[PDB]
Amino acid sequence: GIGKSPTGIQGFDELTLGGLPTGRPSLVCGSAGCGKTLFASTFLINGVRDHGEPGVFVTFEERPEDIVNNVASLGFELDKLIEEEKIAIEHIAVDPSEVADLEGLFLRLELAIDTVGAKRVVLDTIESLFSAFSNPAILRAEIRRLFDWLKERGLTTVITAERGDGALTRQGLEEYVSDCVILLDHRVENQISTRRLRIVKYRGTAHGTNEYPFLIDTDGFSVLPVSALGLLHQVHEERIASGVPDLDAMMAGGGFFRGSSILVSGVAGAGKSSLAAHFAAAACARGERAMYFSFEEAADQAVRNMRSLGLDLGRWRDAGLLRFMATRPTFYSLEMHLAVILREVMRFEPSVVVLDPISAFTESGDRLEVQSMLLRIVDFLKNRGITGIFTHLGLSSLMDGWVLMLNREVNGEFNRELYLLKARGMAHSNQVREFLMSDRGISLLP
Amino acid sequence: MGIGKSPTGIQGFDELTLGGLPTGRPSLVCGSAGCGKTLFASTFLINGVRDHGEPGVFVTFEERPEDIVNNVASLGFELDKLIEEEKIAIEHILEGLFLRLELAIDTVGAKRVVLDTIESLFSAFSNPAILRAEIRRLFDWLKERGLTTVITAERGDGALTRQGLEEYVSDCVILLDHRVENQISTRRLRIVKYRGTAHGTNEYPFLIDTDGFSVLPVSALGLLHQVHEERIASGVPDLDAMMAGGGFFRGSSILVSGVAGAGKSSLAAHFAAAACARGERAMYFSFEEAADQAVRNMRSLGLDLGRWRDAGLLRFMATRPTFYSLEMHLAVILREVMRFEPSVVVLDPISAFTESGDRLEVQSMLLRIVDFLKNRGITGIFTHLAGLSSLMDGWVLMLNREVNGEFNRELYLLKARGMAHSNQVREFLMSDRGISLLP
Amino acid sequence: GIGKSPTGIQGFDELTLGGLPTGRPSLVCGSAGCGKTLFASTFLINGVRDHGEPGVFVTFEERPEDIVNNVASLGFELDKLIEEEKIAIEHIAVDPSLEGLFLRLELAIDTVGAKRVVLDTIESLFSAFSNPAILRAEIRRLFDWLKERGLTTVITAERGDGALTRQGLEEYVSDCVILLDHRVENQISTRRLRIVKYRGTAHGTNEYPFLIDTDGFSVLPLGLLHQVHEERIASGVPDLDAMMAGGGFFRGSSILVSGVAGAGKSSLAAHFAAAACARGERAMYFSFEEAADQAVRNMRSLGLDLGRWRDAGLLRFMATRPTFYSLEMHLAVILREVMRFEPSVVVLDPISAFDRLEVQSMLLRIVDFLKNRGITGIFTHLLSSLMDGWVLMLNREVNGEFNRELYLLKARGMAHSNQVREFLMSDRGISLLP
Amino acid sequence: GIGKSPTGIQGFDELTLGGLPTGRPSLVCGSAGCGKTLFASTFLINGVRDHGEPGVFVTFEERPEDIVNNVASLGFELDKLIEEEKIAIEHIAVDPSEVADLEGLFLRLELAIDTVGAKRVVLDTIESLFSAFSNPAILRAEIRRLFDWLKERGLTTVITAERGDGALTRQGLEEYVSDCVILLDHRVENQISTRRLRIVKYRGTAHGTNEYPFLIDTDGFSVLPVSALGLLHQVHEERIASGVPDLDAMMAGGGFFRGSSILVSGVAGAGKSSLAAHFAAAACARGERAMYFSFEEAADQAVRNMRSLGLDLGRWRDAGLLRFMATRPTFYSLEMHLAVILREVMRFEPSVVVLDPISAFTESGDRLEVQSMLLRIVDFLKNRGITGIFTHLGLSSLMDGWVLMLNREVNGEFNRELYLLKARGMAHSNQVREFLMSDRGISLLP
Ligand SMILES: Nc1ncnc2c1ncn2[C@@H]1O[C@H](COP(=O)(O)OP(=O)(O)O)[C@@H](O)[C@H]1O
Ligand SMILES: Nc1ncnc2c1ncn2[C@@H]1O[C@H](COP(=O)(O)OP(=O)(O)O)[C@@H](O)[C@H]1O
Ligand SMILES: Nc1ncnc2c1ncn2[C@@H]1O[C@H](COP(=O)(O)OP(=O)(O)O)[C@@H](O)[C@H]1O
Ligand SMILES: Nc1ncnc2c1ncn2[C@@H]1O[C@H](COP(=O)(O)OP(=O)(O)O)[C@@H](O)[C@H]1O
Ligand SMILES: Nc1ncnc2c1ncn2[C@@H]1O[C@H](COP(=O)(O)OP(=O)(O)O)[C@@H](O)[C@H]1O
Ligand SMILES: Nc1ncnc2c1ncn2[C@@H]1O[C@H](COP(=O)(O)OP(=O)(O)O)[C@@H](O)[C@H]1O
Ligand SMILES: Nc1ncnc2c1ncn2[C@@H]1O[C@H](COP(=O)(O)OP(=O)(O)O)[C@@H](O)[C@H]1O
Ligand SMILES: Nc1ncnc2c1ncn2[C@@H]1O[C@H](COP(=O)(O)OP(=O)(O)O)[C@@H](O)[C@H]1O
């Protein structure tokens, strides 16, 4: 096979089944601000601090001081690594030389490689040297000289590529001369930007072909890990207590399955948030830890509103079992939102997760995007064994349980009814049940 | 007096080209980066040596042989073994070019040639007429030498090739394409030109998996259905009894429509369990619930899907629609149905694809699925949460409808093609004894 | 009226109102694999075979043996014609490189006494002219030369990146321009031909789909001149027939059987076809969701034995899939089979299986052809004003049981029953009551 | 003001309020086959045969023999005019001269002008001479030399322009140097081609700015005449007899207004075609002449079908009062269809015009195109005083009268009812009326 050098970006390495190709040049293309320089920096830094592989960073415009300080904010301590002689930075600048001896660069490169003992290399803005080459055949020959140099030396090299007016690179050659080609793009849609990565080419390995949204937060380059893939869900035969005993009773077995995904759907003011809060509070009382993701209400406001029904979510927030997360759709974009959901869930290790409401994303993306991000969330939760409570104003087919709460007018008065529409794996009551809200909470009438 | 074809060993490609590539003539596999031109040419050579003994030479102008060999070693091409057996050679590099090629060919007496990165030379020619003359010189040399050549071409910022002339100088031109839509990449092959023969003019999706370069074969053409008189047992004897003759015809396509919690997955599980208990092998494609979850939920109704699975008769496949494209979904389905050769297939629910494509794409996919299963005499069950009765030989509508604050479960036998069927509506009950219709 | 030379493609000659312009050059433009070379080959070979007009194929790049073999499969049999001195192929080659070309041409044309010429891949020469003025001046010199000699010439133009040709001038210097394009839509590729310019004549200006089949370059030639007959047709359901004054529908009519699934659309269409075959008429049944054996099996349930008629050769059952080769291609296949079989009754089941405007045009054309040929057509659907008769078959829920009823919603030119008729399906078939 | 030289294309001259500008150069741009050469030919020919204005046709590639024969099919008898010395053709060809004395062309031009006494000039494929000029400033200067030459001589000149890759002309200069610029385009939509003309520029005059569909039939360049514009309708206080006396009675005054537009709408088999045929037959019996435009039925078939109801449309067809026109939507494109409708109506001078059905165009164009072409037809008819009967399966607001024919099921039987929904300018019955079809025709029950 082909050897794989890992980068340290967990999601990227997973999608590439081990990382970049070892002893070969890799191309990371994109426009300005897409993440190519930071990806190469992370490649080098993680190669040193996770695989004892020293690195050299060749820069043709960006100053070495700039290169270290532009990552100091991510705590990479590149200044540290440079003083410790695990990473070196070689700066090459030109001006009258460009009109027209690349062996000099080869010598300088080899010298830095030997000083640091480098096994990984980064070549940033090679365009500064190769934009002088006007004839395409000559440009191709020289790029081949450089890439074959690196191959011979067996250095794992990440080479930057400016997209310019082109689909991958300005001149449209390095994408064909490289063995692994990655595209980073920063696409805006309805004033919202999303970073996406794509493995366009990778000889000698399978990988993910699709576009994969990624992130450059204060924690650096980060990709959604495919590990939490779909349909590997944990199956539990134990049941969950919802906090509404009269609902829990309607099902044979005493309640919904643990790690089940249950959709509470209805009209506004029908009790969806109330039921979800009941779920979370029952879990926290049992001693589990729960997450409540509000997208329409503030955490303090939800605690208040539920106080009216007798749920003291504040007690759980203080104990540290319940964690509220309030965020509106426009802020934290759809992929951003998926990422924060999954991440904060990993950190808190909840047992029950409530999404109130999953309709808040209905108007923030086409049917496919909304449905697919919801698929990802539900798969993540069930693979972790988390009981998910999704409130809503096709999803029913995706959910393990379905509760419908209706405040309907009859004879000049609104009555609240509850339907258990779906409850896979059990017998359950077909009978509509009237339900009342009060200080005692949600109750069901005979 | 048709032309002569040399097969590539890619079943789908050879079926679409009616024999393979033009023999003794150069073809042009155009494509962007990572679309599979080099892999298609490598497969051409490897299948030539394995299936028909025709030695092969891979002439690369820029990439090195060890890199070629490692690039394909992960797919089990055993290039190194073939080079030692002197069946395949990998040589690195206009009369001089011709001599170097004759050398590379003499290494193993190659009958199949591949030209990788011919752009190294042809980018030097700036004048269009000169470039065209040289290209035609090379292509005519390859025509006369008695070798079947596959030439890779770089699309670049072009429709097929970067300079836009080799596609016109060649006689067989195939575009390899990797198009993204809704973040999903689909690999497609197209025959843009093929002089001397009929062939598939449409776009055809293909995979580059552990099986290599693979095109779905159109040998499962539509409307060649296997027609059987024998009936298939549903596992619900009252349902099968509603139909004169004992139930649905074997090899039929049967839709099970309804609202969530209506019993569609349950009826389909009854079908699969009945088949496995008869000793036939069944396949449950679940697009929404994991295999173990489905087994658990069906145990409640009293079906030991787990027993049938461990017996090897039942194959569960859990697959999220959004993970692939619709074309790739069809390809994966059909491939696994081939590998398993089941008698009963379940798709639970096909409605999970409607979201992932417009009516035309999903309808075509379901056309191909039903045509495949019926051409093989496989009874297909499709659950649904819309005019799909077009492709369905049978149709069962399961309702869980509210009356007086109570939900009654009813069954409609809407379509029973070719048989007297009860058009009455039957109330049913679900229990540990399964699905039972009340008399 | 300009002088025209037929190409031999029925549809193309009909569209161009006689064919290509005589003694003048024509420009067949297209991207790679669109059919310009085959079009030119057909021009020449049909010229020699149908009109005795010898031909010369001047190729600047492609080899003559390649030219012969790339068309041998189509039965054109060019090699015999070269031996017989009806057609010639002349290979002009160029490598790092004015009237000498004209000299060689003239020699070629005189060897075989050619009145038709093809010029394939003049780009070999015209790609070296950088100056646009120079290039078009040379193009004009060539076109003039050909017009002075009076040879009907088809010139191939490579579209390349351009909209017609790579350099964008031959389309202006030529008098007749035909753009062939192989356009993909939903992974389905359709070949279209368009007469961009044809000086001196009216002609079809739209895009016309064509097919390069194993028979070759083919275009489908329909109109609103329906053949009118009073004769009445037996439906197989004599009571339905009786509901109509005189005893049925008009022979040549177009009928729509509409309803839900399991309503009896295919049953009624099979009844029509079986009645026709029984009285001795050739009937055709185009299904787009059912195999022929499946149809005979399912109709034997109601008592129709279509196997009898199929074996007798009176019934021809054809099964296709709509999503394969595009709507106009379908139309073409259905049409060719109707032409072959000269059926009295044609069935299309379901027509709903076939975007909106395309399907509307296809259906209008099918009805037009059947009517003009005098054939009665039974269309099934899961239009009402485009047909002549309309039968609505209902399987409606009443008291938790589906009752089966029939409406005769439309029957142009006759008094029918405004009454609904409850109908029963049984081993004997379709029956009704008042 | 500016002098206007008419071309002979009635619609073009109307849209330009008199034709091209006199003594100035005009540019007719377009791709191949759009109608520029034929427009210039018509310009010259009609200038000679309608305004005693002799012409010269300068051609730079197309042979003079070709130029005459390519119009012989239109009966222009250009060979005649050339022998009679009213039009001349001057052919200029080049080849080695193009690499690099335009005064020679000026001399040749002036000589032809003086021979024929020309007042109109056409310059066809000036590109053959001016494509040699590479520098844009020099090309502009030379084009200005030529156009100023023509201006000085006061010749009304039509200059061809090849569109090429450009929006109007290949080099993008003549459109700015000309005083009148016209664009001819041949746009395909759903495999159907439509010819459109546009006055892009015309200094010194008002004109139509919109795109105007035109035609090149066997009668040559032809434009829809805007003269039959909208809302100048003829207003009649006399009434029409529909042939259904019981319908005519429901309206105060004895029937619909003459020159009225009446929409018969309903379900299939409801009697729309029958009522329309009754209208046409009543008119033809009165002695008027009527047109019946079928888009779903053949003329013989419609005569048969109506025979069943007792209308002998064959008698009227034979008398010459009734004229049938059968054509399907796809054939005779939407603009094509408008054109044939209007034209054949002008020729036949009908009194009643039936369009059966105007729904046949529902699926052949977007709502705006269908509605606007229908607007044009209705305006044309009412401006001529023609009574229009439009059958159908927003238009109601456009129609002067509205009849609704419904075959509705009740108690397992279909009954036919007739509603007079609208009838401007009169009192009319609000009562639904049952109607029966028989050999006696359409009758209404008390
Ligand atoms: N220290 C940092 N902290 C947070 N975000 C950063 C940091 N550095 C860069 N980014 C984000 O990642 C992007 C990466 O920029 P960079 O890769 O250096 O430029 P390019 O991709 O053009 O080479 C920036 O545009 C910014 O949005
Ligand atoms: N003490 C109480 N007694 C009765 N009803 C209450 C009480 N407190 C809150 N509610 C009801 O709860 C509703 C809000 O429920 P909520 O959980 O927000 O449902 P949704 O999520 O559908 O908006 C209010 O409309 C109100 O009728
Ligand atoms: N061993 C492998 N396993 C799976 N996929 C592979 C393997 N080798 C190559 N591929 C696929 O083929 C693509 C490269 O094919 P190749 O023909 O070499 O590229 P190009 O189209 O640039 O010539 C990669 O993007 C990858 O998805
Ligand atoms: N033992 C049982 N008794 C009664 N009903 C049951 C039993 N087990 C499962 N069910 C019913 O089966 C339903 C799940 O059926 P399923 O096959 O998932 O239908 P669908 O696929 O239409 O959602 C539950 O809603 C429940 O009502
Ligand atoms: N013998 C044949 N049988 C069927 N189809 C053919 C045959 N020869 C050529 N074709 C078809 O004709 C198309 C174009 O042929 P050709 O005219 O040579 O292309 P070009 O546009 O380069 O001239 C091909 O795509 C192929 O499908
Ligand atoms: N022997 C029979 N007795 C009663 N009904 C029958 C018999 N054979 C077939 N059928 C009916 O015919 C129907 C199939 O009719 P079909 O022609 O397929 O209608 P459609 O084309 O509208 O689907 C079935 O639903 C079935 O009820
Ligand atoms: N004699 C004719 N009879 C009918 N239609 C014609 C005639 N001559 C030309 N046409 C139509 O009008 C168009 C005008 O062509 P022309 O104006 O000469 O070319 P261009 O517009 O490229 O200069 C032709 O493409 C053809 O469709
Ligand atoms: N002699 C008759 N007696 C009764 N009804 C008739 C007679 N002749 C024709 N019809 C009726 O005329 C209808 C056709 O009317 P038509 O004018 O085509 O209406 P539409 O234009 O709405 O289709 C048929 O459905 C039929 O019921």
Q: Which residues on chain B are in Cβ contact (under 8 Å) with A431? A: 405-407
Q: Do chains B and A touch (3 or more CB pairs under 8 A)?
A: yes
Dihedral (C-alpha) B196, B198, B201, B206: value to the nearest 10 degrees? -100
Stated as kind and residue range, the H or E segment containing D124 is: strand D120-124
User: Cis omega (within 30 of 0) on the bond before B349?
Assistant: yes
**Measured CA distances, C229 to A406, C233, C252, C331, D46 (Å):** 63, 11, 7, 25, 49
Q: Who among B32, B72, B296 is closest to A235 (CB)?
A: B296
Asked if residue C252 has its Cβ within 6 Å of ligand 5, the reply is: no
Q: What is the SS3 assignment for D346-389?
A: HHHCCCEEEEECHHHHCCCCCHHHHHHHHHHHHHHHHHHCCEEE
- Beta carbons within 10 angstroms of residue D185's beta carbon: 16
Using CB atoms within 10 Å of the CB of residue C428, give its burial: 0 to 12 exposed, 13 to 18 middle, 19+ buried: exposed
Residues of chain B in contact with residue C288, where contact means CB-CB under 8 angstroms, are 223
Q: Are strands A352-356 and C152-158 parallel, antiparallel or unpaired?
A: unpaired
Residue type at B163 in one-letter notation = Q
* Ligand of minimum distance to the alpha carbon of A357: 2
Q: How far is the CA of B300 from the centre of ligand 4 (A)?
A: 8
Q: How far is CA A356 from CA A325, A326, A418, B187, in A?
A: 10, 10, 18, 39
> In the numeric block, which tokens belong to residue A268?
């506004």
Q: How far is the CA of B81 from the centre of ligand 3 (A)?
A: 21
In whole angstroms, give the CA distance from residue C214 to residue D72: 40
* Ligand 3 mean position, distance from CA A212 (Å): 19
The token duo for C357 is 């405007």
Method used to determine the 3D structure: X-ray
How long is chain C?
434
CB C321 within 8 A of CB B391: no
CB-based contact (8 Å) between C396 and chain B?
A: no
Return phi, psi of residue D219, to 5°.
-95, 5
Element (H, E) at D149: helix D136-153
Smallest CA–CA distance, residue A431 to chain B, in Å, is 5
Helix or strand (DSSP H, E) at B411? strand B406-416
SS3 sequence of chain A? CCCEECCCCHHHHHHCCCCEECCCEEEEEECCCCCHHHHHHHHHHHHHHHHCCCEEEEECCCCHHHHHHHHHCCCCCHHHHHHCCCEEEEECCCCCHHHCCHHHHHHHHHHHHHHHCCCEEEEECCHHHHCCCCCHHHHHHHHHHHHHHHHHHCCEEEEEEECCCCCCCCCCCHHHHCCEEEEEEEEEECCEEEEEEEEEEECCCCCCCCCEEEEEECCEEEECCCCCCCCCCCCCCCECCCCCHHHHHCECCCCCECCCEEEEEECCCCCHHHHHHHHHHHHHHHCCCEEEEECCCCHHHHHHHHHHHCCCHHHHHHHCCEEEEECCCCCCCHHHHHHHHHHHHHHHCCCEEEEECHHHHCCCCCHHHHHHHHHHHHHHHHHHCCEEEEEECCHHHHCCEEEEEEEEECCCCEEEEEEEEEECCCCECCECEEEEEECCEEEECC
DSSP string, C276-313: HHHHT--EEEEESS--HHHHHHHHHTTT--HHHHHHHT
- What's the burial of D444, exposed, middle or buried (CB within 10 Å: 0-12/13-18/19+)? middle
Contact present, A71 and A35 (Cβ < 8 Å): no
What radius of gyration, in Å, describes the C-alpha atoms of chain D?
A: 28
**Count of residues for chain D?**
446
User: Are the C-beta atoms of A403 and A260 separated by less than 8 Å?
Assistant: no
Closest partner residue to C320 (CB to CB) among B197, B223, B327 is: B223
Which residues of chain C make contact with D393, given a CB cutoff of 8 A?
A: 384-385
Cβ D274 vs Cβ D400: under 8 Å: no
Burial A304-343 (b: 16+ CB within 10 A, else e): eebeebebebeebbeeebbbbbeeebeebbbbbbbbbbbe
Token digits for B436? 């039972």
Question: Which contacts qualify for C162-166: CB closer than 8 Å, 24 or more apart?
Answer: C163/D31, C163/D165, C164/C27, C164/C29, C164/C196, C164/D32, C165/C27, C165/C29, C166/B164, C166/C123, C166/C127
> Distance between CA atoms of B22 and B196, rounded to whole angstroms?
9
Sign of CA dihedral C121, C123, C124, C126: positive
Q: Atom 20 of ligand 7 has which residue's CA nearest to it?
A: D33
Neighbour count for residue D237 (Cβ, 10 Å): 8
Exposure on the CB side of residue C331, measured as CA atoms within 13 A: 23
Residue with tokens 């050549």: B149
Tell me the longest C-alpha to C-alpha distance in chain A: 93
CB D387 within 8 A of CB D352: yes
SS3 (DSSP) at B349: coil
Strand partners, C197: C177
Separation of CA B114 and ligand 5 centre (Å): 24
DSSP code string of B221-277? -TT-PPP--SEE--S-HHHHHHBTTSSEETT-EEEEEE-TTSSHHHHHHHHHHHHHH
Rounded distance between C-alpha atoms, residue B426 and residue B438, angstroms: 7
DSSP string, C202-259: ----SEEEEEEETTEEEE----S-------EE--S-HHHHHHSTTSSEETT-EEEEEE
Q: Which of B243, B389, B413, B417 has the most ligand 6 atoms within 8 A of CB, as the residue to mutate?
A: B417
Q: Distance between CA atoms of A130 and A393, rounded to whole angstroms?
A: 58
* Chosen from B293, B295, B320, B384 to mutate, greatest number of chain A CBs within 10 A: B293
**Amino acid, res. D93:** A
Closest CA to A214 of A204, A224, A205: A224
Whether D28 contacts D39, CB under 8 Å: yes
Cα D123 to chain centroid distance, Å, stands at 27
Contact B380, B230 (CB under 8 A): no
Instruction: State how far the Cα of A240 lies from the Cα of A236, in Å rounded to an integer.
Output: 10
Compute the half-sphere exposure of residue D140: CA atoms within 13 Å on the CB side of its CA: 8
Residue with tokens 């996919």: B365
Q: Which residues of A are less than 8 Å from B58 in CB distance?
A: none
Cis ω for the linkage preceding A225 (within 30 of 0): no
CA A118, CA A115: separation in Å to the nearest integer?
A: 8
Kindly list the distances between the CA atom of residue A74 and the CA atoms of A218, C95, D81, in Å, as whole numbers in the listed order. Answer: 6, 61, 87
Cα–Cα dist D301/D273, whole Å: 12
Bridge partner list, D356 = D294
Whether D191 and C201 have beta carbons less than 8 Å apart is answered as no
Residues C236 and C225: their CA atoms lie apart, in Å, by 28
User: In terms of C-beta density within 10 A (0-12 exposed, 13-18 middle, 19 or more buried), how is residue D245 classed?
Assistant: middle
Contact flag for C and B (3+ C-beta pairs < 8 Å): yes
Distances in whole angstroms, Cα of residue D137 to Cα of each of A78, B237, C183, D161, D380:
57, 90, 41, 18, 50
* Gap between the Cα atoms of C330 and C333, Å rounded: 5
Tokens standing for residue C24: 């003048």
**Residue B38: closest CA among A148, A206, A182, A203:** A203
Residue C60's alpha-carbon distances to C124, D288, D428, in angstroms, are: 6, 68, 80
Instruction: Look at residues C163, C220, C166 and name the one whose alpha carbon lies nearest to residue C336.
Output: C220
Closest CA to D205 of D49, D354, D18: D18
Place of tokens 């108007």: A363
Query: What are the C-alpha distances in Å from A325 to residues A103, A346, A356, A378, D63?
Result: 57, 14, 10, 17, 81
**Domains of chain D with bracketed CATH:** 4-223 (3.40.50.300), 245-444 (3.40.50.300)
Chain B residues 28-47 with a CB less than 8 Å from chain A: 32-34, 38
